Amino acid sequence: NLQVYPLTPTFHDLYFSRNAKITCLVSSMKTIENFDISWEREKAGNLEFVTEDPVLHDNGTYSVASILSVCAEDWESGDKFSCTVRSQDLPSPVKKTIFKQNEGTPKAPDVYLLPPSAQELIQQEMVTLICFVTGFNPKEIFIQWMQGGVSISEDKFINTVPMKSDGEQTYFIYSKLAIPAAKWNQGDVFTCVVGHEALPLYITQQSIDK
Amino acid sequence: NLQVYPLTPTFHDLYFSRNAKITCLVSSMKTIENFDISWEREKAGNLEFVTEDPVLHDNGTYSVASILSVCAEDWESGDKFSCTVRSQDLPSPVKKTIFKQNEGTPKAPDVYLLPPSAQELIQQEMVTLICFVTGFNPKEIFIQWMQGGVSISEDKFINTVPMKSDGEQTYFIYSKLAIPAAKWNQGDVFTCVVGHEALPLYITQQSIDKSSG
Amino acid sequence: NLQVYPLTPTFHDLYFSRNAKITCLVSSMKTIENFDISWEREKAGNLEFVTEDPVLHDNGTYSVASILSVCAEDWESGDKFSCTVRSQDLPSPVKKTIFKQNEGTPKAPDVYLLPPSAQELIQQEMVTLICFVTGFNPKEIFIQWMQGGVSISEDKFINTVPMKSDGEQTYFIYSKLAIPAAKWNQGDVFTCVVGHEALPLYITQQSIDK
Numbered sequence: 001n002l003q004v005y006p007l008t009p010t011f012h013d014l015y016f017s018r019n020a021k022i023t024c025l026v027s028s029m030k031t032i033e034n035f036d037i038s039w040e041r042e043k044a045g046n047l048e049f050v051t052e053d054p055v056l057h058d059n060g061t062y063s064v065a066s067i068l069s070v071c072a073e074d075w076e077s078g079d080k081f082s083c084t085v086r087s088q089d090l091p092s093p094v095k096k097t098i099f100k101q102n103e104g105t106p107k108a109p110d111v112y113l114l115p116p117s118a119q120e121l122i123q124q125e126m127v128t129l130i131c132f133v134t135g136f137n138p139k140e141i142f143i144q145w146m147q148g149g150v151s152i153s154e155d156k157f158i159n160t161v162p163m164k165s166d167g168e169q170t171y172f173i174y175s176k177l178a179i180p181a182a183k184w185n186q187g188d189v190f191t192c193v194v195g196h197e198a199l200p201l202y203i204t205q206q207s208i209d210k
Numbered sequence: 211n212l213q214v215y216p217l218t219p220t221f222h223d224l225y226f227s228r229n230a231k232i233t234c235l236v237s238s239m240k241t242i243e244n245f246d247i248s249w250e251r252e253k254a255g256n257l258e259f260v261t262e263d264p265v266l267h268d269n270g271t272y273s274v275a276s277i278l279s280v281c282a283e284d285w286e287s288g289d290k291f292s293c294t295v296r297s298q299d300l301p302s303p304v305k306k307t308i309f310k311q312n313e314g315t316p317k318a319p320d321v322y323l324l325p326p327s328a329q330e331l332i333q334q335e336m337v338t339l340i341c342f343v344t345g346f347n348p349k350e351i352f353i354q355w356m357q358g359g360v361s362i363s364e365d366k367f368i369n370t371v372p373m374k375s376d377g378e379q380t381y382f383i384y385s386k387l388a389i390p391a392a393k394w395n396q397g398d399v400f401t402c403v404v405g406h407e408a409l410p411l412y413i414t415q416q417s418i419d420k421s422s423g
Numbered sequence: 424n425l426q427v428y429p430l431t432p433t434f435h436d437l438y439f440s441r442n443a444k445i446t447c448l449v450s451s452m453k454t455i456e457n458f459d460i461s462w463e464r465e466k467a468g469n470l471e472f473v474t475e476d477p478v479l480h481d482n483g484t485y486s487v488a489s490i491l492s493v494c495a496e497d498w499e500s501g502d503k504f505s506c507t508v509r510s511q512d513l514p515s516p517v518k519k520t521i522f523k524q525n526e527g528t529p530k531a532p533d534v535y536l537l538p539p540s541a542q543e544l545i546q547q548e549m550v551t552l553i554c555f556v557t558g559f560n561p562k563e564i565f566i567q568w569m570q571g572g573v574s575i576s577e578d579k580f581i582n583t584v585p586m587k588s589d590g591e592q593t594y595f596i597y598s599k600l601a602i603p604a605a606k607w608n609q610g611d612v613f614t615c616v617v618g619h620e621a622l623p624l625y626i627t628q629q630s631i632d633k
Contacts, residue, residue, distance in 0.1 A: 112336055114324050118423065125344060126322050132386070134335055160370055160384070174370070174384050176342070208327070225438060226624055228496050255469045281494035283441050318572070354624070359531075361623055403624055410574055411439055411567070411616060413626035 003028050004085055006096045009075060012142035015202055016195055020075050022068045022098050024083035029054065029062035035087040037066040042080040045071075075100055106198035107170055109136035113192050113206040120181060127181045129208070131192035134165065134172035138197060143175040146191045146205075152177065184210065213238055214295055216308045219285065221407050222352040230282040232308055234293030239264065239272035245297035247276045252290040255281075286310055316408035317380050319346035323402045323416040326394070333391040341402035341416070344375060344382035348407060353385045356401045356415075362387065394420060424451055427508060429521045435565035435618060437495045438625055445498075445521050447506035448488040450481050458510040460489045465503045468494075498523055527592050529621035532559035536615045536629040539607060547604035554615035554629070557588070557595035561620055566598040569614040569628070575600065608633060 005025045013019050024037060032054055039049050048069035057063035066083055075081070082097040114130040131143060139162045145152040157177040165172050175192060193205040215235045223229040234247055242264055249259045258279035264272035276293060285291075288310050296303040321343045326336055341353055349372040355362035366388055372381040387400065394400075403415040428448040436442045447460065455477055462470050471492035477485040489506060498504075503522040535557070539550040554566055562585035568575035583597040598615060607613075614630035 110335060112327055112329065114327055114340065117322070117324055117418065119322050125320055128342075128344075130324065130340065130342060130384075132338070132340060134338075155376070158373075158376055160373065163368070163370060165388075166365065166368055172386070174340075176382070178375075228499065230496070256467070281496055283443075283492075283494055286441065356623070359623070405624070410569070410572070411618075411626050413624050415628065 001028060001089070003090065004083070004094055004096050006083070006098050008098060008100075008140075009070075010142065011140040011195060011197055011202075012144075014072050014075070015197075016142070018072065020070045020072045022070050022075070022081050023065050024068075024085070024096055024098075025063070025065040026085055027063055028058050029064060029087065030089045031087060032062060033088065035064075036085075037064070038084045038086070039066065039068050040082045040084060041070075041074075042082070043074070043077075045074065103138050104169065105137060107135055107137035108198045108200065109133045109141060109194055109196045109204075111192065111194045111204055111206045113190075113208045115208050115210070116184065120184065123181045124178060127184050128176045128178045129184075129190055129192070131175035131177070131194070131206070132172070133175070133192075133194045135170045136162075136173075136196050136198060137170055139171055140197060141171075141173060142195045143173070144193050144195070145175070145177045146193060147183075148189050148191070211238060211299070213297075213300065214293070214304050214306050216293065216306050218308060218310075219282075220352055221350050221405055221412070224282045224285065225407075225412055226405065228282065230280045230285050231277050232280060232285075232291055232293075233278070234276045234295065234306075236274040236276075236295055237268050237271070239274060239297070240299045241297060242272055243298075245274075245295075247274070247296075248294045249276065249278045250292060250294065251284075253284065255284065313348050314379050315347065317345055317347040318408045318410065319343045319351065319404060319406045319414070321402060321404045321414050321416040323400075323418045325418055325420075325422070330391060330394070334388055337391045337394050338386040338388050339394075339400050339402070339418070341385045341387070341404065342382070343384075343402075343404050345380045346372075346382075346406050346408055347380055349381045350407065351381070351383055352405050353383070354403045354405070355385070355387055356403055358399050358401065397421075424512065426451055426510075426513065427506070427517050427519045429506075429519050431521060431523065432493065432498065433565065434563045434620060434625075437498065439565075439618060441495070443493045443495050443498060445491045445493050445504055446488050447508065447519065447521070448486065449508060449510075450484060450486045452477070452485040452487060452510065453512045454510065455485055455487075456511065458487075460487075460509070461507045462489065462491055463505055463507060464497075465505075466497070468497060526561045528560060530558055530560040530593055531621045531623070532556045532564070532617060532619050532627075534615065534617045534627055534629045536613075536631055538631055543604065543607065549601045550604050550607040552600045552602065552607075552613055552615070552631075554598035554600075554617065555595070556598070556615075556617045558593045559585075559596075559619050559621060560593055562594045562596075563620060564594075564596055565618045566596070567616050567618075568598070568600050569616055570602075570606075571612055571614075 007023045009020045050067045054062040054064050080099045084093050086093045111133045119126045145157050159175045162171040162173040189209050191205045191207045213236050219230045260277045262275040264274045267273035291308045292305045324340045369385045372383045399419040401417040426449050430446045432443040474489040477487050480486040505518050505520045509516045535555045537553040543550045580600045585594045585596045612630050616628040
């Protein structure tokens, strides 16, 4: 009976898309009657309480998510945003408070773009361009791909979990972009843009070509 | 109250370390009396039934592990192996079966060792050979490193979680080898050796060095 | 009247084929009546007993072989397995011990693959690639050939007997591949794979091209 999963806004939605969504997802719910979600902020301000209809998720139970529209300055100022669920399943409400947790000194990630080595003979595999970016101290990172200015869709590249480097507090993530071998042989530039809050400016990209 | 956490032996200890040891880890417990586990097979053979003493793990509970020494030939044949835990906290014994589950048609991994790129001025984080190996259908890879014959220690390199390439059931995994820049500049050959059960022979090694052409 | 022919399982069948079989072949026999073999093991375990039907070999004598399946962990550990044959010809039963005996300190073989000689001209259909692998102390070896990724069949290479080195306990064995002369000039990578116990990981392979 794990009901509420509070999802922090991602960095790609916080600054580079400018929509800070704080969502309280009531994952498991048994009844719809006498059920509501009340938002609250420790600082006086607007409260765009938006909720979704219950749907049959998990083991056929109800799943409701409450979406709050907050300012990107408001979440990054250290304010505490709380959602208070209450229903017949829960004897007592759980005040789930969402805020930007500091994780020590942030470190700017170091983007390294890996060109394919001499095994690119086959048409699809090993033509993948791997964006080994490492060193970022907070886990909130986003990586996109561009082939000369135009963005590449999310299906063509797949990222990993930002695993923690051993011995250090810094993390590391790989971003591979599967492209046809003909595209890499055309000599066009491929830019791996890496967005992170610890960079001097929140965009830093690396460009490689044959 | 999630008592039974079973586990399976990986590919490295099944063929290249021979420690085919299925373990029935009972992580969460409340009582230590009137509790025992019995190891049983669906085929006749040996029962090297070994149990560990409970230890204070998790949220201050008792964690019990029961290790059974089995032949690797019986494990790969799909022999059903069930640990039967039973205690006062369980109204009925939990008999969870452990066996080699097939996951479709196995596909041979394609090992691809990648040299560090052009900004090799710094000493550690750039100079990291990445053993990108992809296309293995069972998610039971094991990757080791050797600087020529001698095995690199199991803490200089960190693997990732084998995750599916979106579109097929073929996984992919990396392993960066954190080495100093001076070590790479010696011209010594770094070999990434990769072992998987879908390979024609269960070891494949990819070797690169500075100016590998 | 040399009845018992023990046969240890080869290393290739021990690990990389899993068909670890111990056979007490009885080539020379007189009467098949009142004859049976009772296998036994030093440590308690399963006795996968099977005997193939007698056949006419040697100088008109019936050949009886009893195949027993062994765990590779139950043969590497040094457990002694003995077959106890008993026939009308033998006045007393023969208890021949079959086990993985020690040969010495196991030394890892040194695989040197040799390109074809400068006389790759007059002679074609036979540019021979020699896999000189030497230095292994236990003479249990298996050598296969791989063209790229696909394996070469066992009829296209012939291996010498493991020959002792002059003045040492180490051995050396030769493996030649009789590939066509046109095949060598394509530039395809020919790989000789050598399997030995004393190797860190039991498969070690070397490869070259033109």
